[PDB]
């Protein structure tokens, strides 16, 4: 239904000829190897040429009640569990993809239950003074608006200690720094490439008299423009779940693995970044605290590490 | 494939004969696979372009 | 690479990055083919020919470590990657396969940026595992000829003007 | 064929009666659970009672040649390989046993290829001055004759630094101290119990003119009397392989998991200990070095870790 040539999704004999030429297209590379790339879904050599020398979440039919009513749910990973007694969002942002053949032949090293588990990433305060689009982060977080000059390697203290409050939680950078002795971080500092998904949950307990909303954002490849648009009205294009005090005391969000390569380089690339920003400023009841405490959790989903060699931290 | 092996295949040959043993040597926890041939290396294709 | 009886354990005899700064300028037939194209993939076949004496004994550990910000400083640090302890007195040549433990499906052949994530796969180094030994009046040194060729899964695409 | 009662290997009705009594015996406990215990072989709840409120290696037919002849072999584990060009001993000391049901329900965390691999444990010198029964160990080794007062925890420097030369390599104590940043040690310091076998190899390159023999001992539960008997003539009852310079330049020995419990407690128990002692003192040719360098390797076989909790080192 277009006058232009969108491509035949491959290479055809009639495209390139000595009488006429059309736009050239690339075909799919058929490769053998170990299945990997996609998280939660991953599970004699001879040359083919002769040699010269050789011879529904949101529905009006199912309305979810406010904080008052009993509506319990739970999230489990490894030996960790987080419970709630009221309406709580818990969504995988994107559906898991299909596995792909890996270019490397080495068998992966898996941390298992010791690594893939729900970890207490950070504990932070949420005051009423924070306005719309205010990114909240604590001691384990990092000030990342995209304008900060990151001194390599990211483990340098100046990157995490700033004159103003931190804003982001770069994965796995923030997770590895929070728990450097974990089995996931042990393999992370020993392997050149990794692969896993990420699940972030935040618990904010407020009474039936408290009001306010927080958005749990998972930002892919966080850069200056991307972080600022996530603060704006269009930010909801990115994976999100809102923690509204009217009905919820917690909100969960999970995202599968993403990267230009099937395996991400350790200590040099942050595919996902968590952002806990304010949609509706905290509106606490009179004669009560003007701030509520928040507990941020992080969960690596289906981890695999390739390329074992010496210890090189981030 | 096995994770460990006490009686593994040795990896020493002889290049003096005139040909290099380009076969991937078997290793534990390693799965060597071949790759499809690109049309870039073929001399009939390579030399068809102007220089 | 030279190897004498005076060489102690954990002594480095050679090291090279598997990047377009080295693999495209070794002087080998494969380096010219790599320089003609922009991308490469697959395993690399390394052949270490022991041209010493039949009376010589010893071990040289050949280590291949994947991509890292800093190369291995010591022998035990290099032995944390894919390695093979090679006893020189057996068959003449050592068949060491350099596995394609890569982040991406293809590696770039850009001499201007060899340490890029989409360019280098790591480092390959030779260390003295067990000192060179032999009877008196035997040569005090033994040369090891390092050869490099393409593996059965090696490929190259996207032609360019020779990198060097 | 004995007058005494050896037991019927179980409990019989005729044993204990009001008319006569015989020696009581214990029966086998039939338990359900996850298969574990044995290395290299491991792969609704309701109560059954009503409540009151409820309604050949050595053969003359196959003689192995001396160091001169070509007789290559190899040992591989993970991404590690060790080659030889002459006759070399390579034996699993004991055959692997059958798996047993575990008392704990938690799923194990496995290091995989990153952990189960051949590591360079230590590099030590073997001089001709060492006599019969001289235990050799280097910087990563420990002086353990059984008489040393070990200050708890074993990680204390005084245990590894002594006035005399070290003698033993306690597993996993020596392995974890040699590589504290390894994925195996990461899980070791995070889990209360572990389970794996051990393979130790030593390479000693000597010319056709060199003479001498070393014994690679794997001593179970090393104590004062046990270590001293391993130095003596009867020591060969323990797992052993001899590295004779007449024919060999290396010798390999592997032993499966042993312990009173199905899983060994981390940082508090050393099931196996390696001992590289001299059988025949080094007899080097004149005008050549009076000492040869040795390289000791260590390999954990099929590892599994249970009981994840905080970081507690050895």
Sign of torsion over alpha carbons D9, D14, D17, D19: negative
Residue among B7, B28, B30 minimizing CB distance to D90: B7
- Given a contact as 3+ CB pairs under 8 Å, which chains touch D? A, B, C
Chain D residues in contact with C9 (beta carbon < 8 A): 123, 293, 295
Backbone angles phi, psi at D181, to 5 degrees: -100, 5
Q: HEC profile for A170-206?
A: EECHHHHHHCCCCHHHHHHCCEEEEEEEEEEEEECCC
Contact present, D106 and D306 (Cβ < 8 Å): yes
Helices (H) and strands (E) in chain B, counts: 1, 2
Q: Neighbouring chains of B at 3+ CB pairs within 8 Å? A: A, C, D
Q: Where are the domains of chain A?
A: 1-314
- Among D222, D219, D124, which residue's Cα sits nearest to residue D166? D124
Partners of residue C81 in chain A, C-beta under 8 Å: 307-310
Distance CA D269, CA D274 (A): 14
| C163: number of Cβ within 10 Å | 19
Any CB–CB contact under 8 A between B3 and chain D? yes
A313/chain D closest Cα distance in angstroms: 10
The structure was resolved to a resolution in Å of 2.1
Instruction: Give domain limits for chain C.
Output: 1-164
Under 8 Å between Cβ of A133 and A277 = yes
Rounded-to-integer distance, Cα D154 and Cα A227, Å: 50
Cα(D66)–Cα(D86) distance, integer angstroms = 7
Within chain C, residue ranges assigned H as helices are 29-36, 75-78
Half-sphere exposure of A233 (CA within 13 A, CB side): 0
Closest CA to A15 of A25, A30, A29: A25
Q: Is the dihedral of CA D35, D37, D41, D43 positive or negative?
A: positive
Query: Which residues in chain D are contacts of A114 at CB distance < 8 A?
Result: 109, 187, 190-191, 305, 308
Distance from C-alpha of D258 to C-alpha of D269, rounded to nearest angstrom: 11
A107 vs D110: CB contact, 8 Å cut-off? no
User: How many Cβ atoms from other residues are within 10 Å of residue A14's Cβ?
Assistant: 9
Give one DSSP letter per residue of chain A, joined into a string.
Answer: --SS----SS--TTTB-SS-B----PPPP---S-EESSTTT------SS--SS----S-SSSPPP-SSS---EEEEETTEEEEESS---EEESS-----EE-S--BPPB--GGGTSS-EEEEEEEEETT--TT-EE--TT-B--SS-S-PPSSTTSHHHH--SS---BEEETHHHHHH-TTSHHHHHHTTEEEEEEEEEEEEE----TT-EEEEEEEEEES--HHHHHHHHSGGGGGSSEEEEETTT-SEEEEEE----SSSSEETTT--SEEEEEEEEEEEEPPTTS-SEEEEEEEEEEEEEEEEEE-S----
Between CA D113 and CA A309 the distance in angstroms is 11
Inter-chain touch B5–D77, beta carbons under 8 Å: yes
Query: Which residues is D198 bridged to in the sheet?
Result: D255, D300
Q: Tokens representing D147?
A: 């008489």
| Interface contact A46, partner C, CB < 8 A | yes
Between chain A and chain C, the number of residue pairs with CB atoms below 8 A apart is: 86
Asked if D214 contacts D50 with a C-beta cutoff of 8 angstroms, the reply is no
Task: Name the region of D151 (left: φ>0; alpha: ψ -120 to 50; beta: rest).
Answer: beta
Overall CATH class of domain C1-164: mainly beta
Query: With an 8 Å Cβ cutoff, is B26 touching chain A?
Result: no
D279 CB burial (10 A radius; 0-12, 13-18, 19+):
middle
Residue of C97, C107, C157 best to disrupt the B interface, most CBs of B under 10 A? C97
Q: How many beta carbons lie within 10 A of that of residue D286, not counting itself?
A: 6
Cα–Cα dist C104/C117, whole Å = 9
CA distance C125 to C15: 4
Sheet holding C107-108, edge to edge: C107-108, C37-41, C155-159
Site from D71, D82, D127, D183 to mutate, C interface, most C CB atoms within 10 angstroms? D82
Distance CA A237, CA D63 (A): 75
Is B35's CB within 8 Å of A32's CB? yes
Q: Does residue C68 sit in helix, strand or coil?
A: coil
CA distance A228 to D279: 73
Indicate yes or no: CB of C87 within 8 angstroms of CB of D293.
Answer: no
Q: Which of D29, D32, D39, D30 has its CA nearest to residue D105?
A: D32
Phi, psi of D292, rounded to the nearest 5 degrees: -120, 145
Nearest by CB to residue D74, choosing from B8, B29, B30, is: B8
* Contact (CB, 8 A) for A258 and A182: no
**What CA–CA distance (Å, rounded) separates D218 from D275?**
6
The alpha-carbon gap from B31 to the nearest alpha carbon of chain D, in Å, equals 12
Residue D300 makes CB contacts below 8 A (sequence gap 6+) with D115, D116, D172, D175, D184, D196, D197, D198
- Residue A97 CA to residue A258 CA, distance in Å, equals 10
Q: For residue A100, which of A38, A43, A40, A28 has the smallest C-alpha distance?
A: A38
Of C12, C30, C33, the C-alpha closest to C160 is C33
């Amino acid at each position: 239904n277009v006058t232009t040539d969108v491509g035949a999704n491959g290479w055809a004999p009639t495209v390139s000829t000595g009488l006429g030429d059309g736009p050239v297209s690339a075909s799919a590379d058929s490769l053998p190897g170990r299945s990997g790339g996609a998280s939660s879904e991953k599970t004699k050599v001879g040359s083919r040429f002769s040699k010269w020398w050789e011879p529904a979440p949101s529905s009006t039919a199912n309305p979810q009640p406010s904080l008052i009513a009993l509506n319990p749910s739970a999230t489990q990973s490894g030996n960790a569990s987080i419970l709630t007694g009221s309406t709580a969002p818990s969504l995988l942002a994107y559906p898991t993809a299909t596995p792909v053949p890996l270019p490397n032949p080495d068998e992966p090293s898996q941390p298992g239950p010791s690594g893939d588990r729900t970890w207490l990433l950070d504990t932070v305060t949420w005051s009423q003074e924070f306005t719309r689009g205010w990114n909240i982060a604590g001691s384990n977080g990092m000030q990342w608006t995209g304008l900060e000059s990151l001194i390599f390697p990211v483990s340098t203290d100046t990157n995490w200690t700033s004159t103003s409050s931190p804003t982001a939680y770069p994965l796995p950078f923030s997770f590895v720094r929070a728990y450097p002795d974990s089995s996931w971080a042990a393999m992370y500092n020993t392997h050149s490439m990794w692969n896993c998904g990420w699940r972030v949950q935040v618990t904010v307990n407020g009474s039936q008299f408290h009001a306010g909303a927080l958005i749990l954002y998972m930002v892919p490849e966080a850069t200056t423009h991307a972080i600022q648009t996530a603060r704006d009205n269009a930010g909801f294009v990115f994976p999100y779940v809102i923690l509204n005090l009217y009905e919820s005391n917690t909100a969960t969000i999970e995202v599968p693995y993403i990267s230009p390569t099937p395996n991400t380089s350790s200590g040099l690339h942050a595919p996902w970044t968590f952002y806990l920003q304010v949609l509706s400023p905290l509106n606490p009841p009179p004669s009560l605290p003007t701030s509520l405490s928040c507990s941020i959790y992080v969960t690596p989903v289906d981890s695999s590490f390739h390329g074992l060699r010496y210890l090189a931290p981030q | 494939t096995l994770t460990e092996d006490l009686d593994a295949p040795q990896d020493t040959g002889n290049i003096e004969n005139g040909a290099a043993d380009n076969s991937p040597q078997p290793r534990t926890t390693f799965d060597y696979t071949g790759n499809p041939l690109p049309p870039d290396t073929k001399l009939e294709n390579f030399f068809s372009f102007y220089r | 690479v030279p190897w004498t009886m005076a060489d102690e354990p954990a002594e480095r005899l050679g090291i090279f990055p598997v990047s377009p700064s080295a693999i495209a300028g070794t002087g080998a037939p494969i380096s010219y083919v790599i320089s003609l194209f922009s991308q490469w993939r697959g395993e690399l076949a390394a052949h270490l020919l022991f041209t010493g004496s039949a009376q010589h004994y010893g071990r040289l550990v050949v280590c291949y470590t994947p991509a890292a910000p800093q190369p291995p400083s010591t022998m035990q640090e290099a032995m944390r990657g894919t390695y093979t302890v090679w006893d020189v007195n057996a068959a003449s040549t050592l068949e060491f396969t350099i596995p394609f433990i890569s982040n991406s499906y293809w590696k770039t052949v850009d001499v201007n940026n060899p340490d890029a994530l989409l360019s280098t796969t790591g480092y390959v180094s030779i260390w003295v595992q067990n000192p060179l030994v032999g009877p008196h009046t035997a040569p005090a040194s033994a040369l090891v000829q390092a050869f490099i060729s393409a593996g059965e899964s090696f490929n190259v695409r996207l032609m360019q003007n020779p990198a060097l």
